[PDB]
Write a protein that binds this ligand. Structure first.
Ligand SMILES: CCN(CC)S(=O)(=O)c1cc(Nc2nccc(-c3ccnc(-c4ccc(NC(=O)NC)cc4)c3)n2)ccc1Cl
Ligand SMILES: O=P(O)(O)O[C@H]1[C@H](OP(=O)(O)O)[C@H](OP(=O)(O)O)[C@H](OP(=O)(O)O)[C@@H](OP(=O)(O)O)[C@H]1OP(=O)(O)O
Ligand SMILES: Nc1ncnc2c1ncn2[C@@H]1O[C@H](COP(=O)(O)OP(=O)(O)OP(=O)(O)O)[C@@H](O)[C@H]1O
Ligand SMILES: [Mg+2]
Lengths: 310, 820, 332
């Protein structure tokens, strides 16, 4: 008489591709408290869907055709199109909510909207800003996935999104995930430059991008002392897919993909869960709060002010 | 570095700085600090050095050109040990070093001429590095280290083997599968003289320290109700409803805003203990308002389950749902695991309640004011409930083979009874102490109870020390004096035996203890006589309550197998429960099996006997070997259950019966596939246990002798060359005889001496008066222990006279003269 | 108190001692090590090891000295102090008095009612009054301060049983060693318990060789056998593993008493040992008499069992625990 409610096999659609709410996740929610919400953000081919799938209910040794979050297929890469649309939803058995996100400012959505405001160009930017603000106001942590280092345009977008957010202020933690890392990026000399650039580029961001999720203490660098870094921000690197002398494998210079994925998952799960509103909330209450926030963000006033400026 | 390979990889250049010295001693600064910021240089140097050394067979033959390279292997070993012992190595560097170490090790034992290379210190440093490099987060590295250690298992000192035993014990319970099998094989490759030693285990100590540190910390209050519900469902019902879930749960229960080692997070024992403690903390901190029900609902549920288990303990023919029936061999082990977890949960709950209403000092943090004020007013109810269920808890603990739980509960119950349940408590506590081999505690309890009719406790105290003959004689005397009728049976002289060393429940207990005593010494005739005497006593006294709880069919089967009558043994075995005799593999154990370890041991013994008789009948090569190998493999896999369970708790020791059963199963599996052609088919019980296993009774050697005589008799049906088992059998028999004589078991000692040599004092005198000197000394010692000191002294003098004119006469003449 | 660092980055604290000769402590530690060496053979077939914890001391001349620091051990007085604080806090809802103040608060009214006064000398005091005060004080302090502590400090029942057996054996060994040597002034601050293994270790090895009998308030108990110590041994008390362990220890010491006597004789004829701080000869004779079994007898040689029973009885009778120093804390 204490069996679990149900087990989710595949992620559902929390928000339709037309920016419409979809109330269909209450069937898998309970009345428990102390819930954790994780969101993702990134460009078109960064790999947010794969990261979310591997961090929620998947393993690297499994296949990409059975992932909880649909990933880009080989036939789709040749056409230069996107796969994830709208916002997804999935909750693991540990009562951890995972939220996916479509690419921001991606040319695929723009091209699809061409054959369908003053011009059909600021619409994509506003949709991206709306999603960023929503994830920044109803999620406990947000992970930013970057295909390459220093895009120089994501920081400005993040600051602008946080400046136009809906609303003793609450600022969720920010995580910088560098996907498809190489050996050259796994050196202390380059690490210092990376941390310095990240810290100097977000000096007045008001977000919690430091003091938590320190990969230096996760045994990634055995002999690297903590004082070697002026300010270790929350940055993590994810590498590319992976008689006796002649059988020695090649030298990669970076830890195994599975090891880093497991470490990242453990660190994400062992994170804090601060309060969102000025009251305690449960799973159902959190769902209702998120729905109300999305409804308010859609018919907001700051967005119109920013729209007349473009 | 890459260009230097032209001269480094030469096929035979006399320069001043040698390439080997340049890459091994000149460039020694790359491993100090450059290995952290520039690991590529270190990897390249190690790679070129390995490539240059592998082309010359690591310079083994040498250990002009030969004289110049007379100290290369030592340097290589020292470098490998120093590098492996470090803790700031990279994944690639560690993998390369492990590959090099494995290649060097496998290389070491191939020759029979490299034996002196095992005494130099560099080898010890290399072994130390290999042992310290295991137990890491990486799985492949651990597997490589285990394989390397298993390669050159022999030629290592007692210290290295002792450390390997602890490493294997801690690794036996891992979330993976390959690690468990690899370490299990490595452990099975270690002799019994070291696995059964009483040395301290460092890994177990670290695990206990980590658990203590976590418990002493302040409560986290992060355990969600769903986690508790899942744990309770998996313990009480067996269904966890979760698809390595322990690690995920532990990680989800932590917080970064607000410290068990990571290497220990892959062990299921630590995770289970942490989950149990967290569940108990959540139950206590929630005012007993768990999702299971109200404050009284949880108590009623636990009481009902405990009462059901206690009732089933009295009569095995109960068939308790969700506790005695399983679907395959995997559920049987889970049943015992769940029972152990339940007992641990109850103990933790009691500790938390006591700390809540009373408090501790420097051990547990004081709970909030609300918890203390609530537990202070409702302390009487908790004490009453605990006292009411203590009787059933003792029985449940005894059934699960956990004498510590029942002993602690019995002590608490006795203390609480400061004002006819007094005899049963003493009986249960005495039995539990006897199972732990603690005669001092038994004697103390006997003396303490004498100040309140209870003189039979001394018999159990004597039995706990290993004196089966005296214990059985005392049991018969007590039963005869308490019942009123002569219940004595044929046995050895009472005077010689002594010189060498009124309720139905009490009568039944004494009878069962006597039967178990006779079964332990492997005296089938005595068991039959005891059964006849018991039946006659019951028929002449109308007791209607005495009944021996021992399957006589199994005893008859054992007697037939030991006597050599396989024809009757097969017929007797056809009636025992379980799978039919070999002519499907996962479900070998029968259903409705109680979680009592004794039942599991009996089933394992039955399976071994079935395999032995099947092999004997089939022999008189893949005709009847494809199935026997699978049967033995499954038996060995199931026999490792008790060893794995022992690691779940801080026991610092391993069961002897389970370990011996597993070793016997492995020996049978090796002999069925090798037809007695390798030294791995023998039991590792050697004479070395004389100076390191003096804390064990004679039962351990009974199984070894039983399974060794079978192979000895089977040797007559093999025409090809075999291994010499006569020497092994003689040594094993002599050691067992010495162990039996040291405890006063003259009846068993006489049988062993007669068997090795191929009921009255004069009988021994008229029957006794490489292993020659040892056998003669043992015979003299037995004669002296029997009372005939003059005869023993005369025989020893004659033996010394004959030994003084022998060839060696090193450890024989001196020993005989000293004893005389 | 200082701190040192080794090659293996290990912290090794020490302690300074000036104006106090530590030459005798070194000899005492050497004697303890020699005694512990005799248990090497018996430790090969027994789960609870027969060992006596001790530290190392080294003199730096005539008055200075460096004493090793033993970590991980908690004094027994801490448990009593915490219990007193908890009781006071609980009584407050619906500082703590010192042992001397608490003892006087009960010895005052009793003496005033019996007819005497506090001005009378301690020697001329009624025995019944002291016995009644001790009985009234023991009825207030619970005897589960040490047992429950060890029980809560464990994790699994097997660990609890192991630590309990180890603690009982260690206590028996220490008690026998102290009785043979004659160590005195064993208050709660001079006894430490190791929650990791349950072993007991002593601290101040100053009042030894029967030196407590010549103090202002002589003591007759051989060792400390307080209520808490007895309760921590189990429900049996001193009739289980404690008595057997004591008998075994005495047998081992009596079998090899020749080496102990030789070592003591060597200690006596030591120009670097300040005994006064024929006394050495008397001490050696007393130790020899105790080892030979003729502790208190003209010519009868008491057996091991009889000696253990007599020593235990002399250390548990209320007639000897009442007439003791206030700081000894005979009620806890
Ligand atoms: C709670 C307060 N404490 C208990 C009092 S403690 O000291 O702070 C403490 C002590 C330990 N354990 C420990 N270990 C090593 C040494 C000592 C130690 C301490 C004090 N005095 C001596 C001493 C003095 C004089 C002589 N010599 C002579 O008297 N005549 C020749 C010999 C020894 C030794 N204690 C552990 C924890 C803590 Cl807290
Ligand atoms: O039967 P063994 O294997 O030869 O053992 C004997 C002897 O046994 P016995 O007492 O039965 O004669 C003693 O063994 P334990 O009593 O310690 O178990 C032991 O010491 P004790 O004789 O003093 O009791 C020692 O004899 P010893 O110390 O004189 O050498 C030893 O002989 P070995 O060590 O030569 O085998
Ligand atoms: N670390 C990686 N190493 C190798 N291949 C990767 C890695 N991460 C992603 N990929 C692959 O590259 C592509 C990235 O698309 P993916 O499905 O992971 O999500 P995405 O780029 O966030 O998608 P979307 O276009 O919806 O934003 C996929 O084909 C995936 O298999
Ligand atoms: Mg996607």
């Amino acid at each position: 008489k204490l069996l679990p409610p149900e087990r989710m096999k595949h992620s559902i659609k929390l928000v339709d591709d037309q920016m419409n709410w979809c109330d269909s996740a209450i069937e898998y929610l309970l009345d428990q408290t102390d819930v954790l919400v994780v969101g993702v953000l990134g460009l078109q081919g960064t790999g947010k869907s794969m990261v979310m799938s591997l961090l929620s209910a998947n393993t690297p040794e499994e296949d990409q055709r059975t992932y909880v979050f649909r990933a880009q297929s080989a036939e789709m890469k040749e056409r230069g199109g996107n796969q994830t649309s709208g916002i997804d939803f999935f909750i693991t058995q540990e009562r951890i909510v995972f939220l996916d996100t479509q690419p921001i400012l991606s040319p695929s959505i723009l091209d699809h909207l061409i054959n369908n405001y003053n011009l059909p160009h600021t619409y994509v930017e506003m949709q991206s800003l709306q999603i960023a603000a929503f994830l920044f106001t109803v999620c406990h942590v947000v992970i930013v996935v970057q295909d390459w280092f220093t895009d120089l345009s994501l920081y400005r977008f993040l600051q602008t999104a946080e400046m136009v957010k809906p609303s003793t202020e609450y600022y969720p933690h920010l995580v910088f995930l560098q996907n498809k890392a190489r050996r050259e990026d796994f050196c202390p000399r380059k690490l210092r430059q990376m941390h310095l650039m990240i810290d100097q580029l977000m000096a007045h961001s008001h977000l919690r991008y430091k003091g938590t999720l320190s990969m230096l203490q996760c045994n990634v660098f055995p002999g690297l002392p903590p004082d070697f870094l002026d300010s270790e921000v929350n940055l993590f690197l994810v590498p590319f897919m992976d008689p006796l002398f002649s059988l020695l494998p090649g030298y990669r210079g970076h830890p195994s993909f599975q090891s880093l994925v497991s470490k990242l998952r453990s660190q994400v799960m062992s994170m804090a869960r601060p309060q969102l509103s000025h009251t305690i909330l449960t799973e159902k209450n959190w769902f209702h709060y998120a729905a109300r926030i999305w409804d308010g963000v859609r018919k907001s006033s700051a967005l119109a002010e920013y729209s007349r400026l473009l | 570095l890459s260009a230097l390979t032209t001269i480094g990889n030469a096929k035979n250049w006399a320069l001043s700085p040698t390439v080997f010295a340049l890459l091994s001693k000149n460039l020694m600064i790359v491993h100090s600090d450059l290995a952290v910021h520039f690991p590529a240089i270190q990897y390249a140097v190690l790679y070129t050095l390995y490539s240059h050394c592998t082309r010359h067979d690591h310079f083994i033959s040498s250990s002009t050109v030969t004289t110049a390279t007379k100290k290369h292997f030592s340097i290589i070993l020292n470098l490998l040990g120093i590098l492996l012992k470090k803790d700031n190595l990279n994944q690639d560097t560690r993998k390369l070093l492990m590959t090099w170490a494995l290649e060097a090790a496998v290389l070491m034992r191939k020759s029979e001429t490299y034996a002196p290379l095992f005494s130099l210190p560099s080898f010890h440093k290399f072994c130390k590095g290999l042992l310290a490099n295991t137990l890491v987060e990486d799985v492949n590295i651990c597997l490589q280290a285990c394989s390397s250690l298993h390669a050159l298992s022999s030629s290592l000192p007692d210290d290295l083997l002792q450390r390997c035993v602890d490493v294997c014990r801690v690794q036996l319970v891992h979330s993976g599968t390959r690690i468990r099998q690899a370490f299990g094989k490595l452990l099975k490759s270690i002799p019994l003289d070291v696995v059964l030693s009483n040395n301290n285990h460092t890994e177990i100590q670290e695990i206990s320290l980590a658990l203590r540190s976590h418990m002493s910390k302040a409560p986290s209050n992060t355990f969600h109700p769903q986690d508790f519900s899942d744990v309770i469902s998996f313990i009480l019902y067996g269904n966890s409803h979760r698809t390595n879930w322990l690690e995920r749960l532990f990680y989800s229960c932590q917080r970064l805003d607000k410290t068990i080692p990571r290497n220990l997070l892959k062990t299921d024992a630590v995770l289970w203990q942490w989950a149990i403690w967290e569940a108990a903390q959540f139950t206590v901190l929630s005012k007993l308002r768990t999702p299971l029900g109200r404050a009284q609902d949880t108590f009623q549920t636990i009481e009902g389950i405990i009462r059901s288990l206690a009732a089933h303990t009295l009569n095995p023919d109960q068939d308790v749902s969700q506790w005695t029936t399983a679907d395959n061999d995997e559920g049987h082990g889970n049943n015992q695991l769940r029972l152990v977890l339940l007992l641990q949960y109850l103990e933790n709950l009691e500790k938390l309640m006591y700390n809540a209403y009373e408090g501790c000092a420097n051990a547990l943090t004081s709970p909030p004011k609300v918890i203390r004020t609530f537990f202070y007013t409702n302390r009487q109810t908790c004490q009453d409930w605990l006292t009411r269920i203590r009787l059933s808890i003792m029985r449940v603990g005894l059934l699960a083979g956990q004498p510590a739980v029942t002993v602690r509960h019995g002590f608490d119950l006795l203390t609480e009874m400061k004002t006819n349940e007094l005899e049963v408590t003493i009986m249960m506590v005495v039995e539990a102490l006897c199972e732990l081999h603690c005669p001092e505690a038994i004697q103390g309890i006997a003396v303490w109870s004498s100040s309140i009719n209870l003189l039979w406790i001394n018999s159990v105290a004597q039995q706990a020390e290993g004196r089966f003959e005296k214990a059985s004689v005392e049991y018969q005397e007590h039963l005869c004096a308490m019942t009123g009728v002569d219940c004595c049976i044929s046995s050895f002289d009472k005077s010689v035996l002594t010189l060498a060393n009124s309720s139905p429940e009490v009568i039944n207990y004494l009878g069962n203890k006597a039967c178990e005593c006779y079964i332990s010494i492997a005296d089938w005739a005595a068991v039959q006589e005891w059964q006849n005497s018991i039946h006659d006593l019951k028929k002449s006294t109308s007791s209607t309550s005495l009944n021996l709880k021992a399957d006589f069919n199994y005893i008859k089967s054992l007697s037939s197998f030991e006597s050599g009558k396989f024809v009757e043994c097969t017929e007797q075995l056809e009636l025992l429960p379980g799978e039919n005799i070999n002519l499907d593999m996962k479900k070998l154990l029968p259903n409705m099996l109680s979680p009592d370890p004794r039942e599991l041991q009996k089933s394992i013994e039955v399976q071994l006997l079935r395999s032995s008789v099947c092999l004997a009948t089939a022999l008189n090569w893949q005709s009847i070997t494809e199935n026997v190998v699978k049967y033995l493999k499954q038996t060995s896999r199931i026999a490792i259950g008790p060893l794995r369970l022992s690691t779940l708790t801080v026991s610092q020791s391993l069961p002897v019966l389970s370990t011996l059963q597993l070793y016997c199963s492995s020996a049978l599996e090796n002999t069925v596939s090798n037809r007695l052609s390798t030294e791995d088919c023998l039991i590792p019980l050697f004479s070395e246990a004389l100076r390191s296993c003096k804390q064990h009774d004679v039962r351990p050697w009974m199984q070894a002798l039983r399974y060794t005589m079978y192979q000895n008799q089977l040797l007559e049906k093999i025409k090809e060359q075999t291994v010499p088992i006569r020497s092994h059998l003689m040594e094993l028999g002599l050691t067992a005889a010495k162990f039996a004589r040291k405890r006063g078991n003259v009846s068993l000692a006489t049988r062993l001496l007669a068997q090795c040599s191929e009921t009255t004092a004069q009988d021994l005198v008229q029957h006794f008066k490489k292993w020659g000197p040892e056998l003669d000394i043992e015979k003299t010692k037995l004669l002296y222990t029997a009372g005939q000191s003059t005869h023993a002294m005369e025989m020893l003098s004659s033996c010394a006279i004959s030994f003084c004119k022998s060839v060696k006469a090193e450890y024989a003449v001196a020993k005989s003269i000293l004893t005389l | 108190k200082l701190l040192f660092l080794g090659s293996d980055g290990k912290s090794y604290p020490y302690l300074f001692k000036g104006l106090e000769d530590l030459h005798l402590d070194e000899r005492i530690m050497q004697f303890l090590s020699i005694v512990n060496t005799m248990f090497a053979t018996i430790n090969r077939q027994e789960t609870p090891r027969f060992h006596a914890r001790h530290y190392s001391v080294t003199p730096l001349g005539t008055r200075s000295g460096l004493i090793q620091w033993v970590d991980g051990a908690t004094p027994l007085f801490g448990l009593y102090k915490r219990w007193q604080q908890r009781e006071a806090a609980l009584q407050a809802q619906k500082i703590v008095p010192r042992p001397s103040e608490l003892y006087y608060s009960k010895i005052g009214p009793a003496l005033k009612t019996v007819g005497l006064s506090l001005d009378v000398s301690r020697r001329d005091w009624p025995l019944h009054v002291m016995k009644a005060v001790l009985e009234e004080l023991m009825e207030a302090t619970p005897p589960n301060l040490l047992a429950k502590e060890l029980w809560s400090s464990c994790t699994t029942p097997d660990e609890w049983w192991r630590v309990t057996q180890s603690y009982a054996r260690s206590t028996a060994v220490m008690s026998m060693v102290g009785y043979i040597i004659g160590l005195g002034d064993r208050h709660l601050d001079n006894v430490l318990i190791d929650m990791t293994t349950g072993e007991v270790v002593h601290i101040d090895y100053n009042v030894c060789f029967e030196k407590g009998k010549s103090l202002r308030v002589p003591e007759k108990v051989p060792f400390r056998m307080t209520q808490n110590i007895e309760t921590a041994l189990g429900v049996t008390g001193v009739e289980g593993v404690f008595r057997l362990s004591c008998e075994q220890v005495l047998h081992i010491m009596r079998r090899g008493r020749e080496t102990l006597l030789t070592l003591l004789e060597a200690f006596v004829y030591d120009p670097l040992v300040d005994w006064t701080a024929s006394y050495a000869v008397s001490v050696w004779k007393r130790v020899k008499a105790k080892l030979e079994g003729r502790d208190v007898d003209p010519n009868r040689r008491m057996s091991v069992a009889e000696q253990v029973d007599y020593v235990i009885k002399e250390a548990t009778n209320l007639d000897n625990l009442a007439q003791l120093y206030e700081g000894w804390t005979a009620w806890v």
